[PDB]
Paper text:
Here we identify family with sequence similarity 118 member B ([name]) and FAM118A—two understudied vertebrate proteins—as vertebrate-specific sirtuins with similarities to bacterial antiphage sirtuins.
We recombinantly produced and purified full-length [name] (referred to simply as [name]) and its slightly truncated variant lacking poorly conserved and likely flexible terminal regions (designated FAM118B24–334), both with a noncleavable His6 tag. This approach produced electron density maps of [name] filament fragments composed of five and two protomers, at 5.0-Å and 4.1-Å resolution, respectively (both obtained using a focused refinement in the last step), and of FAM118B24–334 filament fragments composed of six protomers at 7.8-Å resolution (without focused refinement) and two protomers at 4.8-Å resolution (with focused refinement). Despite the apparent helical symmetry of the filaments, an asymmetric reconstruction approach produced higher-resolution densities than helical reconstruction, similar to what was observed for another filamentous systems, likely because of structural heterogeneity within filaments.
Author numbering:
A (entry chain D): 28 to 55, 138 to 326
B (entry chain C), C (entry chain B): 28 to 326
Write the structure that this text describes.
Amino acid sequence: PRKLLPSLKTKKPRELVLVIGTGISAAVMEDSGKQLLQSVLHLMENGALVLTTNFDNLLELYAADQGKQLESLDLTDEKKVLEWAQEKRKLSVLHIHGVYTNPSGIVLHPAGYQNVLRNTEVMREIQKLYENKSFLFLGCGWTVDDTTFQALFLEAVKHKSDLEHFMLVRRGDVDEFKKLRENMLDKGIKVISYGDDYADLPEYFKRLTCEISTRGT
Amino acid sequence: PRKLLPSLKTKKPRELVLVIGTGISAAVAPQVPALKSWKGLIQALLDAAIDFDLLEDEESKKFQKCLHEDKNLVHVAHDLIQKLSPRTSNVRSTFFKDCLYEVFDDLESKMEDSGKQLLQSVLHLMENGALVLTTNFDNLLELYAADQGKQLESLDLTDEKKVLEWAQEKRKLSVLHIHGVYTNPSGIVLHPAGYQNVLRNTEVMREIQKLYENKSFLFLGCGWTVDDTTFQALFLEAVKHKSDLEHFMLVRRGDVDEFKKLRENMLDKGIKVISYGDDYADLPEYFKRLTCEISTRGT
Amino acid sequence: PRKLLPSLKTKKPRELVLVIGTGISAAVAPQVPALKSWKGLIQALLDAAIDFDLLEDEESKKFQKCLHEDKNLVHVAHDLIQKLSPRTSNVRSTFFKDCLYEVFDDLESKMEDSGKQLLQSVLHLMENGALVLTTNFDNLLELYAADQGKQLESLDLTDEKKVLEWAQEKRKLSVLHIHGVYTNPSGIVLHPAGYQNVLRNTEVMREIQKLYENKSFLFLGCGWTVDDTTFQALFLEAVKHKSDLEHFMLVRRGDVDEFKKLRENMLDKGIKVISYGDDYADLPEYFKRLTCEISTRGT
């Protein structure tokens, strides 16, 4: 009889920035993992962006399973990042630390974040994303507190009172929502529930995409 | 088949202000539990907060006990707003809105033509120039008007300009939800201090005194809106000179002494009563007979 | 069709003053059951009350006995007024005004041609310099006078001071009621309990010499126009000289002694009967011939 949080349920795929933590790579390939990445493929095709901390290329490889090819960016490829942030590069995925496929492209040292902080053109697009869009985060074992994320959004955008962003996490206690919620609402984001096992993350999120896209399209 | 009270039947659309009460928005639908009463409604706000995993087990059952009392459940909804909305007021939290959105949607899909005819009849008097105000949180009139006949705007008592134009009969865009309307939850004032702030201004109080003297008000479905707090504080306090020109109410006949008790009691408050004693599907048919009579005398 | 008793044509129109009965206001919609015979007025207020919730079915069955236990019927109407209008301090009470308008509404809808001839004739008789008095609450003779282009002044004795002008004959086209007036049912006084309290101004009763010997009455349609004692009380307390009372009544032929007796009583009182072959629409033409003969000899 389960339901999906309605304000996030109103959202239409162009509206969204999908930020992917390690927990989705952990949920993934298993047959339920291929059904998750099938859901990701539909979202990004319908005009969301996908971004990830993760160095893997599971998304680009799953695009080969269902008749597509998807392009990987790293934060040294500032030209393609500008075209991605301007919505022009459809089928382009960002890996924030970079992707294992490009060794010089990987950014980890503070100077890699500072290269984006120096790029006022891409930083203006980063502010613009956070002003315009609603963001959905997944599997936040690092992403919200990530030193790249903290440099890239958190130095750059101060509308932290005025956000309309959502997260998923699998709720085990009152304190787990609260404790998350306090730092999350200081960043500006709101918490949401699923709550039985990691198997709900594929199943819930596939029906969330179905309702988002069937309303939006 | 039934008569119209002739001093009411001969009134015109410019003269009137209508009130719709909670029973109507339920009665339109043969199959909506969640609006049948204030107890059905507060049951569904906890159903949303429970099923979305937004209220904890202890808090849910603690409020459920308080709601079992039947002791002013309308005021227990004030206590639920005090729990739900964070008072670090610069933070525009969504959660209260997300509760309400679960229940106050998928309404129209169930409905029947006799209910739609009631909404069209109400809209015809509003269009022809009546001002409408209502008890309810819902939007059924604004959805039904936006769909097939008018621009309809939903208003709460917080907005000084929009209430001033409503009092001046200018803002014929609007339907006035005295308490507050579910697609604007930040606006909701169940707690007295907000409508008491509308009492404070001397020129606004001239417009309010003028409003109660000038027109005839009709109430529908059940009229208990006379004593649902906000209505009493602004309108009823102003009886400095008890002119009380005719205002009118419908009721369903019951067993006869209940109707008698109401009739006597409200006629001393200032307000006249009329009966029907039939299947509720005839209540929309009766309201068509009254609607034609008023509107054809106006236009 | 047997013509004018030659007493009639002699009288110059400003000498006459008239009173209108039952069958006249019936003939201005004569298939409506509520006027066919005067018990029908209460039959219709009861048949309204069964649906319109003035009284229970058991109070209704008590009045059904009162319909079979007839005579006293005009003070049965006074007792029914005392049932339907005890009062608070002032205001506009729900049971009464807003129930009479089941029977004194929706007459004007049926002002047929044969009926309008009588009211037409009376109206020009008013313009020809008479004064007029009317039994009923009803306003037919006010409305079909504004149709021909004159807006009548209604009089009833609760408008206390205006008799100062009416006995001076100054308020031309003013019509003075008896069983009150439909535009202000508050004015009703069916009984010695009411009307004569105004006539405590005994200069009016003195000038009623000038209004009962120096001038001539004519009475339409009935016999009911005097045979319940109202047309003893408001007039015989001033004067009783049967030699020079100088007044008339229109009637119908029937079985011989049952026609004769009313002529015998009336002629002994000092009022003169006029009689023809019975049928309803002939009275309209009888009255117009009489009016043409009077108004031409008054020209």
